[PDB]
């Protein structure tokens, strides 16, 4: 529960309907239910899980940034801005803890294939990164290092087992690079990773079918966009 009584296949089907309806909270609940059935997830199913929670936490993060900016200006008016920022922050942390919980129980340990393990370690990095965005206390450092460790293990596996154009490998590198830039205060590390990733993918585009070429160049453009912003 609350999805325990619904068939796995029905949960997947309803996740896809919720995505078309832009009902991302429903989508994430359906995909959480699907994960909790205990079977491995397919590539499409992993993508559904990731898209759902990305959109849920994306809205929360966007709201948090608005409120944090207002709170900061108000410290340059009562407890209300801090209270409401804290409310959003707590909900955001709960979503991150839920996702990390699914990964730890038991998606990562049951992921035999390199491609599946890389996918989930990348998600682990992302959700510790979102926790780091709002962390201020004694656990900020532990959270940052946990994100780095998850990302780096994913990079190590992706480099041995995936080609440099693989879109999951490219999305991992994109996000690890952003982690370096704005979480770890390592902008040269961020720029170096985005550049090497872009160039190594460029050099293997010649090996791709028309479909794979489109997949790869879509994510390479994001790397270029960040290099453009950062240099």
């Amino acid at each position: 529960g609350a999805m325990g009584s619904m068939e796995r296949a029905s949960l997947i089907q309803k996740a896809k309907l919720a995505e078309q309806a832009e009902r991302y909270e429903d989508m994430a609940a359906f995909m959480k239910g699907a994960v909790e059935k205990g079977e491995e997830l397919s590539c499409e199913e992993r993508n559904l899980l990731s898209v759902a929670y990305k959109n849920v936490v994306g809205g929360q993060r966007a709201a948090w940034r608005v409120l944090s900016s207002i709170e900061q200006k108000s410290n340059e008016k009562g407890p209300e801005v801090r209270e409401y920022r804290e409310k959003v922050e707590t909900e955001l942390q709960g979503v991150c803890d839920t996702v990390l919980g699914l990964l730890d129980s038991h998606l990562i340990k049951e992921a035999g294939d390199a491609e599946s393990r890389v996918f989930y370690l990348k998600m682990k990095g992302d959700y510790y990164r979102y926790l780091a965005e709002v962390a201020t206390g004694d656990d900020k450092k532990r959270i940052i290092d946990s994100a780095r460790s998850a990302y780096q293990e994913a990079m190590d596996i992706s480099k041995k087992e995936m080609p440099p154009t693989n879109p999951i490998r490219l999305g991992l590198a994109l996000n690890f690079s952003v982690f370096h830039y704005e979480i770890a205060n390592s902008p040269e590390e961020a720029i170096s990773l985005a550049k090497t990733t872009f160039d190594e993918a460029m050099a293997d585009l010649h090996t791709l079918s028309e479909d794979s070429y489109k997949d790869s160049t879509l994510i390479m453009q994001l790397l270029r966009d960040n290099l453009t912003l950062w240099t």
Partner: peptide, 5 residues
């Protein structure tokens, strides 16, 4: 413009 992930 905001960096992309």
């Amino acid at each position: 413009r905001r960096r992309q992930t």
